[PDB]
């Protein structure tokens, strides 16, 4: 077995085709299913896997009460093959209320953060063995991507943040080899606040589209040179911005090198990627809450901050149904690298009070060069009947 | 590992021997079992697998209400080893309310159709990665075989239909190589309406026996030349016809090249195959509803439209118990290709109103050259006790 | 991989050491567990597997009512690794209300009998594919060993019976190669009635100790020459007889070549094997019902019909707890062949009326050349609490 | 595959990082989970596994009543991959109310003790086959380590004890090769009473830190020469003693070669290991009951009986939550041997009377040479809600 290099061109993409759906919440009304949140997908050279942060409990279970909370000692990283719902046979690969995983061609790396908010620990687990660990450096919720990291040759990059979420924080890029931290780079550039990055290989390096909880609804970009460990950062230029909350499509604006100072203070994990000067992106349909999910291409949106020209829109989750985090993963093919994405479908507290729990299911789409129709693939659970 | 060619003679067949039974519904009264329909079987070079379209729910579950419906966003293709019932550990391999799967000797191909009725998407997934996709062409429920496809050398064929079910529709044969659609052929011949084909390798090509919802109770045949992509079609000549509804065995008639215009408008998935001039077939026992299942050979039934001479009848499901879809799969042996079949055993709405759900179990028989007795292997669940 | 020959000497045996216990019934009071009976054990070159005839239902399930019945269309052969209880993920390898399985070094063979009592079908499944089948020859419950068969070189033997149980029947020995019946030998010798044989390799051939429902409480022996397919039969000489019902140890008698005409009409599956002129055997402790299980060696018991000299007695199940069928399996070691056995622990109807079901758990002991203590390992479920 | 030698240096350790947590009890309030106690961890060259002594029942199950008892015929050794909770699919690898397991690089060895208290049997199972067994020698609860054994070259050592727990007993060290007992050494040295040893490879030999139920709260040490089978024993010198009950840190004393005669009569399984003249150890936080768990290094604590200078303290379980047994396991790396430990988190009777059962979950930490923060990772189940 060989290290991955991702040294192939991105595949031609006219849009996205359905790929997987787990129906986790619907099953949990008649079965023993983990309570989860912050899920993601990542693939080794053979199969794809779905991950999520468990809440140390099943859904039909007294311990699912108050699982809206984000950090407990009971949260672990769950790992299953894509399409296998999180049942009692699921392997808990580490302790974590924030995590990232990736496969370098030979083995899995998991970055797992747990412990106290003001003094958390990141554990680096490679090939099933703990290789390294680092303590929180700003003493304020050390946290990482909640989606897959990227390994090129033998070196994996992962973006971690520590500090005030709605303000100035310390973001670092770690370079990890067989689980060992071999270098640490500070975030550099014009992206001020960066969190929950959705990274993807863009040979010779790594590109990430992130979440800005501070001063903007246009997403930060972080480019990682995996050889000299240099970092450049900016924002997705597209005048159609990708975060939530945001202004409506008439009033919204963006900049290539600065936050847009529109609907700052909040945000959501999301993704985008470049196709020449165009950008492919997803986002919630509703501008203020996490309802619906839509995907489209913005013509010149990767370079033109005034471009509002979208095309190839697809509705993934219709506007009336709940969405959540979303993120990108990459799949190596015969001759090109495809881009896929997952959407977290959050149900429960606080927005829905019929139940006491908070959990999610997922839906997964993959890039295609063929043709496709329309549809909507929501969570589909009836919370009024789950009593 | 090598591509399959199926370049062996069909095995001598005196009838069929019991092979597998899952008891899915009986278990679901005391366990967490998927609600399913439209199941089928297919084998890689080593093991056999059972597939079905899940309904995104278990049986003992509030979400099993109204699962008589055929297309929802929650339906996925379930895949287990043959004999393993669909429990919560079952892998959902794709999103689908219509599907087909086959193994070419190296990896699995899944054809998965989901989305809106008037604008559905077929996803082509090979070796766990999405390779291609195509949109509905007639904007009227793009749909496929609900049983295994067939791969010869590296090329898999699958029959898809789009358009009016009880009338004129557009049926195409797709040629797929490592998940990529390499050619598309239009249905040609005297079979007017063709749906839910049961295909089997008949080297050098592929043969299918299908369902005619339009003008006939004799089953359409489709012959696929896998090299030049040419298509010839006709009907099973046998005066004992294989569809449901149908006329009684005295009044029924058939033609080799035309629908019999008897009990048109309805139908059911089924199968048949040729043994020289004879045809081996199965069908429901009751002429008007899906009750019972019987298998027999019609002497000269593959070529004589007037032949009503059956022999080697076996009762698979006695006349008083519910059956459903059935289909063929092929198993490569040491020196010959065997033919096997599955029978869907449907329970629930609308015909049985004691419950609110609709699901099935299955029973599987394989061709034999030995001897066999008699029996009946129904679903066996007591719906009156499942409250 | 190579065919097994079992061409090693039997290991030195001073008794038996605990090996595995599944606690199936205790678990079923708080989990989804198959209802089973007639279990057995068999090992491929790497691991050991436990088999049983399922009743097409779990225990906590309305369909477990009246599972005292022996033959239904819903019974299947369950197969798990030894120590894994029969949960919903268990593979049902075939349809069967009577079965036998063995591994020849390359793949598994399963002999599976199902269908009507007066017209049953034996299915021969090798390496996951149906290879052969045979119909009942006496039209009276074709039935087989309910324990492992034995393969030497490439040839597996299995003993099947058809006809009146409490009288004259037709017993045949089948020789099976890669699932194909290559020869059939009629039972020959002085063993008149032979059923539910417990066979074990005794190179160059196969030896079986069986159950006589007709005229005796001393167990029949069947020796199978695997090359010329010749059969010799007799009885276990030991004056301490191995069947149930039987006379007390003072009044019991035996013969090497004839049934003892004591407590004829009934019986139970069991086992014994030779150690020079000595016999190692197990049997129920109670003489009339299936209570307790004990193992011992009878000095000269393999050749002396008057020998009542036992030694190395071990209690496996104390006299007050329920036992059932038991049987032998063989495990190839570095330089010798060990002998092990399982005991079925039956609970439920008809003897226990607190519940409506009938099922079993198992306990497994293996031959040892070391030392051992005492104990008792019953089923341990409290049926009064399972309501 | 090759035998393990553990011929690498111990890894540099600044403390311990979180590694795994199973949340077994929280899940059992909404799922079918084994009742267990006395768990441990052990790793083959590829993955780590979690073991425990099952009680032959699940938690939500009438048979979990009175599972505070230590020895029943229903207790079996459960084995799962680390992180997979003990669900109904868990393999019961042997019968045991006391056990030890280890992997020599080629296969697993399990030492399994069951049977009567005054006449128990140890079964030695290697590569899935029973190879040897030995009877109790002092006729008073033959018992072993309840954590992993250690194999160097092809030879595994395991420490077993038989006799009065709160007094003089007979402790032997067994040397096992491919499951066969090849030598037996009597405990020799100044450690009088030795039980439940936590052993770890310290090339060229094996070192164990044990529990003294007799005359001391300082832990016995046993050094095993794996070539000449010689045994030296002593006590952990550290003036901060590792057992429970114990005196407070001001009043406690220790000796290198004698029990401290403080809080004799009781004790708990635990661990420690040497780092030059320093000792790394864990222990309960509360001096008298099994509440809390803390880890630290005692400067010169491996050689100085008066040293009370601790540093690098970490709280594993805060002082108000229940702990239990703990033990060490070793993980071979690229160039060094790491040391990890597990902590049993006991819930239920007798200390907690809201429920009738007694069970545990676990938490696992691994040695690290990086940095870490703080936290507390208790069991987290709410027993008041589990009714
Ligand atoms: C079955 O499924 C398939 C696959 O899913 C479906 O096909 C997909 O359908 C969707 C939905 O329509 C399409 O996405 C939309 O695309 C258009 C852009 O494409 C159109 O316009 C292009 C540019 O045209 C202009 O220039 C050309 C010269 O270059 C000139 O000729 C022309 O007259 C015009 O001036 C055309 O190139 C393009 O034609 C091509 O494609 C056609 C297929 O669509 C085909 O017929 C042609 O042959 C040719 O190949 C095409 O006409 C986007 O406009 C659109 O996004 C708007 O609409 C969505 C709702 O769909 C809405 O959510 C968005 O916000 C956005 O709406 C804003 O913009 C509109 C235009 O500015 C405006 O009308 C709206 O009111 C709204 O304005 C608001 O926002 C803007 C900023 O965005 C702001 O400034 C305003 O103030 C205000 O706030 C979608 O992205 C897919 O491309 C299409 N996919 C494929 C592969 O074909 C199919 O529908 C399904 N079939 C059935 C039966 O269900
Ligand atoms: C911890 O666990 C271990 C391992 O499990 C336990 O050790 C095991 O213990 C069991 C139970 O005792 C033993 O099995 C029994 O074995 C004896 C046979 O062995 C004894 O007798 C041998 C022959 O002695 C005669 O000849 C010699 C000369 O050859 C002469 O010296 C002697 O005086 C006598 O004349 C001896 O060789 C043998 O000694 C050897 O072993 C000893 C250990 O046991 C050891 O001390 C010696 O050093 C030496 O090595 C030994 O004394 C069987 O008799 C016995 O079976 C009877 O008892 C069981 C109940 O245990 C009962 O169910 C059976 O039915 C049977 O009882 C019938 O026969 C008896 C004798 O005829 C009679 O007294 C009974 O009333 C009864 O009679 C009825 O049946 C007969 C037909 O059977 C009928 O004709 C009558 O009319 C009537 O109906 C057991 O098989 C194991 O061998 C032993 N295992 C080992 C490895 O040591 C240990 O007990 C446990 N420890 C603790 C503390 O729990
Ligand atoms: C985020 O997480 C990280 C990682 O977990 C946290 O960092 C860890 O924090 C813990 C908790 O403090 C530390 O463990 C404690 O370590 C100290 C020993 O280290 C201190 O003392 C050393 C010796 O100092 C002496 O000598 C030097 C010269 O050699 C001289 O300069 C000095 O003045 C003094 O005389 C120092 O080397 C050491 O400094 C080093 O480390 C510092 C970081 O801590 C750093 O600032 C320095 O730069 C330098 O590198 C340091 O000052 C142990 O004393 C302590 O154990 C005591 O406390 C725990 C509670 O924490 C208690 O449970 C123990 O029982 C014990 O308390 C007894 O002893 C005390 C001293 O004797 C006494 O005050 C207590 O009352 C008590 O006495 C009782 O017991 C004794 C016997 O034990 C008995 O005789 C008495 O009668 C009585 O019964 C802990 O082990 C970790 O080392 C530290 N880890 C790391 C990697 O840094 C961090 O806190 C977290 N951050 C946040 C914001 O949460
Ligand atoms: C996190 O950072 C934000 C900066 O965005 C801080 O909020 C600012 O606080 C000052 C002083 O109270 C106000 O004048 C500003 O209006 C706030 N800014 C915004 C954008 O609302 C916040 O206090 C920081 N948190 C901590 C704990 O330091
Ligand atoms: C689907 O096709 C059928 C043809 O079989 C159409 O039904 C026919 O409709 C015409 C006009 O209403 C009637 O005169 C015929 O008697 C019908 N034929 C039969 C066999 O019943 C049907 O309308 C078509 N559906 C659509 C949506 O076009
Ligand atoms: C085929 O099945 C149908 C039911 O689908 C049977 O028709 C029923 O017959 C009984 C007795 O004649 C009537 O009371 C019912 O009203 C009928 N049911 C329905 C739904 O129409 C029919 O008898 C079966 N045919 C054969 C040959 O067995
Ligand atoms: C099965 O065989 C037994 C022979 O063991 C038959 O039972 C005998 O029947 C005759 C005639 O009724 C009686 O005189 C004998 O006493 C019976 N023998 C015994 C040992 O009880 C039995 O009838 C046979 N069953 C069938 C269906 O033929
Ligand atoms: C187990 O050993 C202990 C020795 O520690 C025995 O307890 C002692 O018994 C004597 C006589 O009754 C007392 O004088 C001592 O005070 C006891 N010692 C302690 C430390 O409490 C105990 O009896 C032994 N058990 C058996 C069954 O022999
Ligand atoms: C160690 O744990 C024990 C309990 O095992 C604690 O003792 C309890 O203390 C409270 C408050 O002092 C008393 O009300 C209880 O009666 C005690 N319980 C028992 C069972 O004795 C003790 O406080 C703990 N010690 C430390 C240092 O935390
Ligand atoms: Ca934002
Ligand atoms: Ca029809
Ligand atoms: Ca008998
Ligand atoms: Ca002690």
From TrEMBL, chains A, B, C, D:
KW Glycoprotein (keyword) present: yes
Coiled coil location: none
GO biological process: carbohydrate metabolic process; viral budding from plasma membrane
Organism: Influenza A virus
Included stretch of the parent chain: 82 to 468 of 469
Protein name per its UniProtKB record: Neuraminidase
Gene Ontology CC terms, in alphabetical order: host cell plasma membrane; membrane; virion membrane
Post-translational modification: N-glycosylated.
Free-text note regarding domains: Intact N-terminus is essential for virion morphogenesis. Possess two apical sorting signals, one in the ectodomain, which is likely to be a glycan, and the other in the transmembrane domain. The transmembrane domain also plays a role in lipid raft association.
Enzyme class per UniProt: hydrolase
Localization: Host membrane; Virion membrane; Host apical cell membrane
Cofactor(s) listed in the protein's UniProt record: Ca(2+)
Active-site feature positions: 70 (proton donor/acceptor), 325 (nucleophile)
Subunit and partners: Homotetramer.
């Amino acid at each position: 077995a060989e290290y991955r290099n991702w040294s192939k061109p991105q595949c031609g993409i006219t849009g996205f085709a359905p790929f997987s759906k787990d129906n986790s919440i619907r099953l949990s009304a008649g079965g023993d299913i983990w309570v989860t949140r912050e899920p993601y997908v990542s693939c080794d050279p053979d199969k794809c896997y779905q991950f999520a942060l468990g809440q140390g409990t099943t859904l039909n279970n007294v311990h699912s009460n108050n699982t809206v909370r984000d950090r407990t000692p009971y949260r672990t990283l769950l790992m299953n093959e894509l399409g296998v719902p999180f049942h009692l046979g699921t392997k808990q690969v580490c302790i974590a209320w924030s995590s990232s995983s990736c496969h370098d061609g030979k083995a899995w790396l998991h970055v797992c953060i747990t412990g106290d908010d003001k003094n958390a620990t990141a554990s680096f687990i490679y090939n099933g063995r703990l290789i390294d660990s680092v303590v929180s450096w700003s003493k304020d919720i050390l946290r990482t991507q909640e989606s897959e990291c990227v390994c090129i040759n033998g070196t994996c990059t992962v973006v971690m943040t520590d500090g005030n979420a709605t303000g100035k924080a310390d973001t670092k890029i770690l370079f990890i080899e067989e689980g060992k931290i071999v270098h640490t780079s500070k975030l550099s550039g014009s992206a001020q606040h960066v969190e929950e990055c959705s990274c993807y290989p863009r040979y010779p390096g790594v590109r990430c589209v992130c979440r800005d909880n501070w001063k903007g609804s246009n997403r930060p970009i972080v480019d990682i040179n995996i050889k000299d460990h240099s970092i450049v950062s900016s924002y997705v230029c597209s005048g159609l911005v990708g975060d939530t909350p945001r202004k409506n499509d008439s009033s919204s604006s963006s900049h290539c090198l600065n936050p847009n100072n529109e609907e700052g203070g909040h945000g959501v994990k999301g993704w985008a990627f470049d196709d020449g000067n165009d950008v492919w992106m997803g986002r919630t349909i509703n501008e203020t809450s996490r309802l619906g999910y839509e995907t489209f291409k913005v013509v010149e949106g990767w370079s033109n901050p005034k471009s509002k020209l979208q095309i190839n829109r697809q509705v993934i989750v219709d506007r009336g149904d709940r969405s959540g985090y979303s993120g990108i993963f990459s799949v190596e093919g015969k001759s090109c690298i495809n881009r896929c994405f997952y959407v977290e479908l959050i149900r429960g507290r606080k927005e829905e009070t019929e139940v006491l729990w908070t959990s999610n299911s997922i839906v997964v789409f993959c890039g295609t060069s063929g043709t496709y129709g329309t549809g909507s693939w929501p969570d589909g659970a009836d919370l009024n009947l789950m009593h």
